[PDB]
Amino acid sequence: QGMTGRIVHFEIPFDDGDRARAFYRDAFGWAIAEIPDMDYSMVTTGPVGESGMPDEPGYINGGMMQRGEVTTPVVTVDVESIESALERIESLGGKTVTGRTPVGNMGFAAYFTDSEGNVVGLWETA
Amino acid sequence: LYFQGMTGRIVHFEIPFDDGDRARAFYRDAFGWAIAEIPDMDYSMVTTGPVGESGMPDEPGYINGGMMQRGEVTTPVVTVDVESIESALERIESLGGKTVTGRTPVGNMGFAAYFTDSEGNVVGLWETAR
Numbered sequence: 001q002g003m004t005g006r007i008v009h010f011e012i013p014f015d016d017g018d019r020a021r022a023f024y025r026d027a028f029g030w031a032i033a034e035i036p037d038m039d040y041s042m043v044t045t046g047p048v049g050e051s052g053m054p055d056e057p058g059y060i061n062g063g064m065m066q067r068g069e070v071t072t073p074v075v076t077v078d079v080e081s082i083e084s085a086l087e088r089i090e091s092l093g094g095k096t097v098t099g100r101t102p103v104g105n106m107g108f109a110a111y112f113t114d115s116e117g118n119v120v121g122l123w124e125t126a
Numbered sequence: 127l128y129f130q131g132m133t134g135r136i137v138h139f140e141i142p143f144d145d146g147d148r149a150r151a152f153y154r155d156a157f158g159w160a161i162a163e164i165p166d167m168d169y170s171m172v173t174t175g176p177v178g179e180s181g182m183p184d185e186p187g188y189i190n191g192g193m194m195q196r197g198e199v200t201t202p203v204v205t206v207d208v209e210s211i212e213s214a215l216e217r218i219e220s221l222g223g224k225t226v227t228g229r230t231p232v233g234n235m236g237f238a239a240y241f242t243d244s245e246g247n248v249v250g251l252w253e254t255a256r
Contacts, residue, residue, distance in 0.1 A: 003187070006188035008187055015246075027218050031129075044127065045136045055186065059189060073201070073249065094152065118141060118201065118202055119202075120141075
């Protein structure tokens with residue numbers, strides 16, 4: 001709460017999941033877990049608390065997904081309401097790519113393009 | 127759960143623009159980001175959450191970033207902190223990645239570089255000078 005606007009998450013798309021996961025595990029030592037029922041791989045880049053959230057400032061965790069909606073890496077902005085945010089984004093000259101979508105029981109995601117045509121994510125907590 | 131030292135964290139992002147004034151207004155307006163054009167850095171600093179006296183985030187769970195004229199950054203980039211860009215780029219290439227640009231001083235505090243991962247995505251590296 002009170003985190004509106006913050007960049008809280010990132011996504012990296014892949015063509016070959018096993019290859020991509022091995023690459024990042026090997027290159028940087030990321031902890032990556034495939035989550036079959038959510039169709040993505042959770043990425044942990046730095047330490048987390050008991051709730052799975054970062055336990056120290058200055059970094060974010062993320063996910064890896066099969067390339068599609070995300071054609072290139074995306075950063076994700078926290079908002080109170082995806083519906084309100086998408087309305088505002090369109091009023092300001094951006095465009096919705098994908099509307100509000102549940103992400104397990106954790107929250108809701110969407111994608112938009114900014115004024116420069118870049119794809120950016122939104123996150124609304126459940 | 128453990129890591130390669132304190133390295134490997136995603137600590138920064140960059141969003142490229144075509145029209146800087148438009149892009150900065152879009153983000154100030156959409157989300158209330160604090161954005162400053164830095165002299166003489168060809169770079170706009172973006173603060174998405176609170177910072178302390180160090181200027182680094184002082185609440186958990188978010189990162190700050192930058193916006194730049196599209197060219198060296200062509201689509202949004204996330205940046206991995208590493209102990210040594212030289213070492214990281216060597217490792218990356220042995221693992222099927224490729225150097226896009228090598229270790230380059232940025233500002234006064236550190237170095238940056240860009241690479242493609244195993245999947246063709248451009249990703250950034252940051253090395254704090256030690």
